[PDB]
């Protein structure tokens, strides 16, 4: 298993620049992408930019072009952040896409920049132990409508993981009490059988085919287990 080590985060003032990294422990053919995502404290996730293994191949969020470029160096894969602005204060973690699986197949631990001066989902969601619950994505024809459909599971404090690809597959260590289905321009992620660890944050996830800079993530969904 390929570990990634991000690191550069720090204090910086508005305008200011810094560069972060992500460390690959060793190279792998599996891996063509490697992938930046931020999440802002108490907020979502939000898609950074990405790199292919060999370089060629660069796309940036709007909300960064033109301000942020990526780069990397033979193991090395670098953020290089300009013109800093207070929303860009968030934890910046790196993570790699395989050629099977999702957008995200496996993560870092995530390194903390602070500056100093689209798919919908339902905000909230609970159940009690054994109860079936669904989380709804609601996208247009450019994004879920023209794209597979993923779904990522957070729980507090940690990266996020791989939980749904390819509308409804499941990756090795997901149970199957998780299912995903697409229709239309619409999503939808199923847990039936409510466990006490099912208490996380869920993002569905479609890439757009249009104005990819527009972003990934959906809104998110709070997920709160009542023992
Ligand atoms: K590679
Ligand atoms: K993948």
């Known amino acids: 298993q390929v570990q990634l080590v991000e690191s550069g985060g720090g204090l910086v003032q508005a305008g200011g620049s810094l560069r972060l990294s992500c460390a690959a422990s060793r190279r792998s053919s599996r891996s063509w992408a490697m992938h930046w995502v931020r999440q802002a404290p108490g907020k979502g996730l939000e898609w950074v930019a990405v790199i292919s293994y060999d370089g060629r191949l660069k796309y940036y969020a709007d909300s960064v072009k033109g301000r942020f470029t990526i780069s990397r160096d033979n193991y090395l894969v670098y953020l290089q952040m300009n013109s800093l602005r207070a929303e860009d204060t968030a934890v910046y973690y790196c993570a790699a896409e395989e050629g099977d699986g999702g957008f995200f197949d496996y993560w870092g631990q995530g390194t903390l920049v602070t500056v100093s001066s689209v798919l919908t989902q339902p905000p909230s969601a609970s159940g009690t132990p054994g109860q079936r619950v669904t989380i709804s994505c609601s996208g247009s024809?450019?994004?879920?409508?023209?794209?597979?459909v993923n779904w990522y599971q957070q729980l507090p404090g940690t990266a996020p993981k791989l939980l749904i690809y390819r509308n409804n597959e499941r990756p090795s260590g997901v149970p199957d009490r998780f299912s995903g289905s697409k229709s239309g321009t619409s999503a939808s992620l199923a847990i039936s059988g409510l466990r006490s660890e099912d208490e996380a944050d869920y993002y569905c996830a479609a890439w757009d085919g249009s104005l990819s800079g527009r972003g990934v993530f959906g809104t998110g969904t709070k997920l709160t287990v009542l023992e």
């Open positions: 024809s450019s994004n879920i409508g023209s794209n597979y």
